[PDB]
Every structure is written in structure tokens, then in C-alpha cells.
PDB file with one MODEL, atoms N, CA, C and O in Angstrom:
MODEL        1
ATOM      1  N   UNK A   1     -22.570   7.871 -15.500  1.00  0.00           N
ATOM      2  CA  UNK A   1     -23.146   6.767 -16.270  1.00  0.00           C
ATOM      3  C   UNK A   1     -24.638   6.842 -16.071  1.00  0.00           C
ATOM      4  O   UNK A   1     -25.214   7.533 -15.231  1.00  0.00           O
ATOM      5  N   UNK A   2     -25.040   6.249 -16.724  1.00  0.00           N
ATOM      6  CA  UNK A   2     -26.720   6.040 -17.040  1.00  0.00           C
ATOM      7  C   UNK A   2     -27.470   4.512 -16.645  1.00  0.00           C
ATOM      8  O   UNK A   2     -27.359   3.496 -17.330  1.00  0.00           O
ATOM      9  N   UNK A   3     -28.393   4.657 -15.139  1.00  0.00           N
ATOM     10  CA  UNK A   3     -28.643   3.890 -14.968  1.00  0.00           C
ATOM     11  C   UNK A   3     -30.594   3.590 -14.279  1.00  0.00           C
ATOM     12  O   UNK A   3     -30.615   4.593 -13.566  1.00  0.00           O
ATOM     13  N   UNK A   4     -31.034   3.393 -14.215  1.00  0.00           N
ATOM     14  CA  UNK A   4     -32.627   3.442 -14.201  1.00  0.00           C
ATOM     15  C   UNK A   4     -32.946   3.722 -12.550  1.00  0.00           C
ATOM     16  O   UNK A   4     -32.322   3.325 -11.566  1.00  0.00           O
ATOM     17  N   UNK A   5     -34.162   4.562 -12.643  1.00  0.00           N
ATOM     18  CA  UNK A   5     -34.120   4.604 -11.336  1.00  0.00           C
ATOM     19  C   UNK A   5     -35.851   5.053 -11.249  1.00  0.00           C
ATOM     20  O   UNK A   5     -36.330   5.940 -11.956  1.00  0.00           O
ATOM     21  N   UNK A   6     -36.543   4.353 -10.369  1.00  0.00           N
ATOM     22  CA  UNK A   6     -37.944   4.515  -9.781  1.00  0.00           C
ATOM     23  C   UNK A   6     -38.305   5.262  -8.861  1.00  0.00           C
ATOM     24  O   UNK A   6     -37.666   4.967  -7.851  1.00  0.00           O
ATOM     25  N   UNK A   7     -39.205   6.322  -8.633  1.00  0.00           N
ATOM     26  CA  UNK A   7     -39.693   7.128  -7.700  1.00  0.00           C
ATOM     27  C   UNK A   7     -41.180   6.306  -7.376  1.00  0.00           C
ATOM     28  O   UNK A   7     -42.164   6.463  -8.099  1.00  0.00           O
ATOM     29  N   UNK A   8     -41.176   5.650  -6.497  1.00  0.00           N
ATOM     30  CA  UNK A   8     -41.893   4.425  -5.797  1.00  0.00           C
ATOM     31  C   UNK A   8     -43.166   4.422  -6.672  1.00  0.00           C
ATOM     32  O   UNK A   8     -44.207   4.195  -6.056  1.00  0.00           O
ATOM     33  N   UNK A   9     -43.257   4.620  -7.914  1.00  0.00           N
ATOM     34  CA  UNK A   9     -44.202   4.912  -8.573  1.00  0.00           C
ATOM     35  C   UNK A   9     -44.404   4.887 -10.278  1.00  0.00           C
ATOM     36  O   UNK A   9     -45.057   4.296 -11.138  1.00  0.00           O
ATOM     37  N   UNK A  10     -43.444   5.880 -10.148  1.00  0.00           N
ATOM     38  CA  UNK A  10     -42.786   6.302 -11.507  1.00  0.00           C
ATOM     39  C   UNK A  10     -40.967   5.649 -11.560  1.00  0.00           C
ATOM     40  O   UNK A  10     -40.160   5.376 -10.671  1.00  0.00           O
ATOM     41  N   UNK A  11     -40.905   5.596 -13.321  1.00  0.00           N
ATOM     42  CA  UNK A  11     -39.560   5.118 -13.444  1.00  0.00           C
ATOM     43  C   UNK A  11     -39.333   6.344 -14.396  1.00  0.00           C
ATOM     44  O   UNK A  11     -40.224   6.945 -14.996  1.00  0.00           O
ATOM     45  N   UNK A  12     -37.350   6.743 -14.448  1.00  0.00           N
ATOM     46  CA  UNK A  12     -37.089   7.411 -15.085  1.00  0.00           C
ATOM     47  C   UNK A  12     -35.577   7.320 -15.493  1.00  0.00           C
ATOM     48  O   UNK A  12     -35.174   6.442 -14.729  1.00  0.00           O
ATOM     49  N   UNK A  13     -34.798   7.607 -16.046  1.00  0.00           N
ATOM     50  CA  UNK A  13     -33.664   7.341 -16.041  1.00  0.00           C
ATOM     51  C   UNK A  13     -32.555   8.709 -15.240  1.00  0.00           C
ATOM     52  O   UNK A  13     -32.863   9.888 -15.064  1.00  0.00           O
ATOM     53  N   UNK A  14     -31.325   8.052 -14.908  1.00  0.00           N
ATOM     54  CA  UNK A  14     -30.106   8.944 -14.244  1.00  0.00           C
ATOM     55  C   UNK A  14     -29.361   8.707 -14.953  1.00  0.00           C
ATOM     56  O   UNK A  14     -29.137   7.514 -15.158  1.00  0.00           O
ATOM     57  N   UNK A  15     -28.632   9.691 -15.654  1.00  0.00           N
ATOM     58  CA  UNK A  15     -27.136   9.842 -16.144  1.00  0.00           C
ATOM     59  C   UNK A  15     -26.648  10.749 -15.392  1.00  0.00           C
ATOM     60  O   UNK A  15     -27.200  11.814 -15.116  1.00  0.00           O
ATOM     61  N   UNK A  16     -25.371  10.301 -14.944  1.00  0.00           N
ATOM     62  CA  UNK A  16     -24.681  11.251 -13.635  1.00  0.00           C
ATOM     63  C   UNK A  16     -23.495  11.459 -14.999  1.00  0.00           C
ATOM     64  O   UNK A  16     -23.132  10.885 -16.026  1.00  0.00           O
ATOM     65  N   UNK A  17     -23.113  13.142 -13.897  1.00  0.00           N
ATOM     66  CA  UNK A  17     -21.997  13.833 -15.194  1.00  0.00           C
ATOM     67  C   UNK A  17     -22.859  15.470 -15.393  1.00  0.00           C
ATOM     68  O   UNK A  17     -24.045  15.688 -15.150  1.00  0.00           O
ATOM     69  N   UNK A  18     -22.018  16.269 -15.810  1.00  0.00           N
ATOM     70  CA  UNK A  18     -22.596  17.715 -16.156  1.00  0.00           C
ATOM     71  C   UNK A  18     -21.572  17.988 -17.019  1.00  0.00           C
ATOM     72  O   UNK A  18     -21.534  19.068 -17.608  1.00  0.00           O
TER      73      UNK A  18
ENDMDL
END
């Protein structure tokens, strides 16, 4: 699933799955 995620800085999104 697809859910938002921040690198203490930057935001980007995660969709888990291949």
C-alpha cells in the first residue's frame, strides 16, 4: 500500500509491493 513518508526534511511517498 501507499503511504507518505518524510526524510527529516524531505517528503516522498512509499508504495510497498514489487
Amino acid at each position: 500500500q501507499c503511504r507518505r513518508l518524510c526524510y527529516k526534511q524531505r517528503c516522498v511517498t512509499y508504495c510497498r509491493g514489487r
